[PDB]
Amino acid sequence: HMYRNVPIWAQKWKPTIKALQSINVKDLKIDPSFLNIIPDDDLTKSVQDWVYATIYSIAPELRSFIELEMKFGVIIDAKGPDRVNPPVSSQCVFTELDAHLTPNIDASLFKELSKYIRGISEVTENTGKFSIIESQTRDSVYRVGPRFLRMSTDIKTGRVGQFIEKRHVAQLLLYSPKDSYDVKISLNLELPVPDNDPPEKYKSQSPISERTKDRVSYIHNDSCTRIDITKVENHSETTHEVELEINTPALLNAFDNITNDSKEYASLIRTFLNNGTIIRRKLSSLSY
Amino acid sequence: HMYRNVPIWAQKWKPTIKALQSINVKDLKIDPSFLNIIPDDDLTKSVQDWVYATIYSIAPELRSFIELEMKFGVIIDAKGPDRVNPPVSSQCVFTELDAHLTPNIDASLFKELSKYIRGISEVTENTGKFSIIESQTRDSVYRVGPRFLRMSTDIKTGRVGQFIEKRHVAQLLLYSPKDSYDVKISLNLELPVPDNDPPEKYKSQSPISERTKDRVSYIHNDSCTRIDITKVENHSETTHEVELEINTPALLNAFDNITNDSKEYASLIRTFLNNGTIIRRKLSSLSY
Ligand SMILES: [Mn+2]
Ligand SMILES: [Mn+2]
Numbered sequence: 385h386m387y388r389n390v391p392i393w394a395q396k397w398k399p400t401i402k403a404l405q406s407i408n409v410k411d412l413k414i415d416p417s418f419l420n421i422i423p424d425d426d427l428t429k430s431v432q433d434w435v436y437a438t439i440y441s442i443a444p445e446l447r448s449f450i451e452l453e454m455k456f457g458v459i460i461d462a463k464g465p466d467r468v469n470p471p472v473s474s475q476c477v478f479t480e481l482d483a484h485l486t487p488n489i490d491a492s493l494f495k496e497l498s499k500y501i502r503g504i505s506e507v508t509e510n511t512g513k514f515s516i517i518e519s520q521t522r523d524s525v526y527r528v529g530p531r532f533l534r535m536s537t538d539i540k541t542g543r544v545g546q547f548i549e550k551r552h553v554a555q556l557l558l559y560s561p562k563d564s565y566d567v568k569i570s571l572n573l574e575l576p577v578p579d580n581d582p583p584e585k586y587k588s589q590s591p592i593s594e595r596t597k598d599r600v601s602y603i604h605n606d607s608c609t610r611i612d613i614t615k616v617e618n619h620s621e622t623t624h625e626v627e628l629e630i631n632t633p634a635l636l637n638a639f640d641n642i643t644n645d646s647k648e649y650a651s652l653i654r655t656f657l658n659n660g661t662i663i664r665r666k667l668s669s670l671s672y
Numbered sequence: 673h674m675y676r677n678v679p680i681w682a683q684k685w686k687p688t689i690k691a692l693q694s695i696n697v698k699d700l701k702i703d704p705s706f707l708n709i710i711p712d713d714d715l716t717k718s719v720q721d722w723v724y725a726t727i728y729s730i731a732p733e734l735r736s737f738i739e740l741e742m743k744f745g746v747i748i749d750a751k752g753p754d755r756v757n758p759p760v761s762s763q764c765v766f767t768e769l770d771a772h773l774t775p776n777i778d779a780s781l782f783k784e785l786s787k788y789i790r791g792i793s794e795v796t797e798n799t800g801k802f803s804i805i806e807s808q809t810r811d812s813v814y815r816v817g818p819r820f821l822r823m824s825t826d827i828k829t830g831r832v833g834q835f836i837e838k839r840h841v842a843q844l845l846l847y848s849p850k851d852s853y854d855v856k857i858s859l860n861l862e863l864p865v866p867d868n869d870p871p872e873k874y875k876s877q878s879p880i881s882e883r884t885k886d887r888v889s890y891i892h893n894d895s896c897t898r899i900d901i902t903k904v905e906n907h908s909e910t911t912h913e914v915e916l917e918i919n920t921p922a923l924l925n926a927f928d929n930i931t932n933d934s935k936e937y938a939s940l941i942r943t944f945l946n947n948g949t950i951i952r953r954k955l956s957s958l959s960y
Contacts (some may be wrong), residue, residue: 396833407697407698408697408698409695409696409697410695410696412939413936413939414894414895414896414939414943415892415894415895415943416895416941416942416943416946417895417943417946417947418792418801418802418892418899418947418950419767419792419950421946422942422946423946423949423950423953425713425715425716425763425949426715426762426763426949427713427714427715427762427763428713429762429850430761430850454828470758470759470760470767471758471766471767471771471848472760472764472765473718473764473765473766474700474714474715474717474718474764474765475713475714475764476760476761476762476763476764477760477762478759478760478761479759479760479761480759483759504706504707509719512751513707552824553690557870559760561712561713562717562718565762587678587769598742600704603705604703606702606703607702607703607704607705607706608702609706611706625682627844647710648701651701651702652702654704654710655702655703655704655705657706658705658710658711659705659706661705661711661713661714662705662706662707662711665711
């Protein structure tokens with residue numbers, strides 16, 4: 385899995401992702417199971433299998449450009465304008481052809497969640513636990529033939545900080561009927577544009593889409609997660625975006641150690657879902 | 673909640689069920705989340721909320737007769753003969769008007785899981801942990817006016833060991849689309865018949881349904897669970913019935929301590945769910 389890439393429909397080893405063992409946590413008053421293991425719940429094994437399939441798909445030489453992110457919105461299907469409404473009542477992977485999710489929560493919950501995360505970062509108990517970056521960028525997209533190169537300019541210093549071809553490799557919709565928002569898990573590739581310099585061919589022609597991004601990012605290094613809260617202006621339609629990002633280097637690293645020590649990858653994935661749940665449930669609790 | 677009962681649509685205090693805390697388990701290489709807790713998944717929460725609401729709806733003096741169990745089958749809906757197939761791919765609470773499950777699995781899978789569990793009970797590591805109970809009983813159902821009384825005779829000594837009215841209070845269906853069988857959770861009451869003795873009124877008249885039950889019981893006391901493996905002759909259609917049950921006493925006891933210490937209840941339901949998932953995943957790995 386570390387030196388080769390194999391399309392999902394052709395993959396055959398699924399090295400086993402171990403369940404947590406009844407560890408050293410207060411000799412429990414009750415055994416967790418008759419095997420004394422905690423089985424992963426389905427949805428977590430689903431994520432653990434999808435991420436693994438999808439990284440394995442991609443060429444090794446491309447995996448450092450990976451971005452695994454979770455974003456909130458509402459799932460909408462091909463026929464109706466409203467939130468889907470399958471006959472289920474706890475969060476699941478959602479798989480209907482042409483179901484889609486546009487990253488976008490209500491402004492007031494958006495302001496309310498940002499206050500809450502600030503608040504948590506500002507607790508004296510967590511003064512060394514988050515790192516906050518504020519950042520305001522204009523993202524201009526140039527079509528070439530055709531492929532789209534995303535140029536990111538920041539506003540506070542006209543510097544041209546990021547020039548990529550962003551590719552969406554895969555996505556999983558998690559229909560979350562107990563919550564006011566569903567989530568989209570996206571596996572993207574941020575491909576670095578080569579020598580074709582940002583300034584010399586593009587800072588003279590007309591982008592086909594420009595997006596201003598006002599963001600605060602909370603990075604929680606001990607859970608390898610970064611929360612991004614962003615107002616984006618679609619040059620002008622506005623969206624409120626809430627995204628959790630898992631750290632690519634530690635994800636890469638744990639994915640290369642799957643066969644020898646499955647626990648690292650299985651805990652990273654659990655941790656990412658754990659965070660996205662806090663989020664999701666806090667959004668719903670402000671909705672009431 | 674311990675001295676009163678309120679109908680599910682009228683309830684208002686849902687006492688918080690605490691999320692596991694990152695306890696003394698191997699100073700983890702990764703934080704569980706940015707709050708240092710593990711949020712319960714949505715399925716486990718759901719079952720948490722439904723078992724609580726449903727207990728609470730029952731009168732205190734009836735609570736000790738509660739039977740809370742899981743069973744294995746396929747969920748069929750009102751329109752068609754096959755397994756439902758809503759657009760979802762991980763296990764979730766399913767809620768469709770008139771979808772039902774009949775407890776029944778394939779008999780070789782049955783024979784293969786019951787060799788699986790007896791093998792685990794016979795492992796040297798678990799020599800003190802299971803208790804096995806074989807029983808053969810014939811269950812006869814007398815209608816009175818109208819109510820259904822269930823009289824159980826065992827076959828190896830014609831004694832009339834159990835006379836009761838079984839009432840189904842509630843149920844929840846867990847649509848399991850990664851597994852070969854889905855699962856029903858049933859919260860029933862086993863009301864013992866008053867002085868109207870079994871012998872003197874009914875051991876003379878015509879039962880409306882009679883069921884022979886060949887059963888093995890594996891009782892795993894430290895995870896407070898009992899597995900029942902039962903062949904049943906429907907006097908004669910045969911069905912193979914795999915049911916797991918949480919211990920009533922321990923359940924009532926954690927229920928009564930929910931406001932003071934949530935952990936006891938949270939732990940028991942998780943344990944229940946973990947043993948379930950163990951059997952359901954064992955079944956599925958035998959169908960392949
Ligand atoms: Mn991102
Ligand atoms: Mn039972």
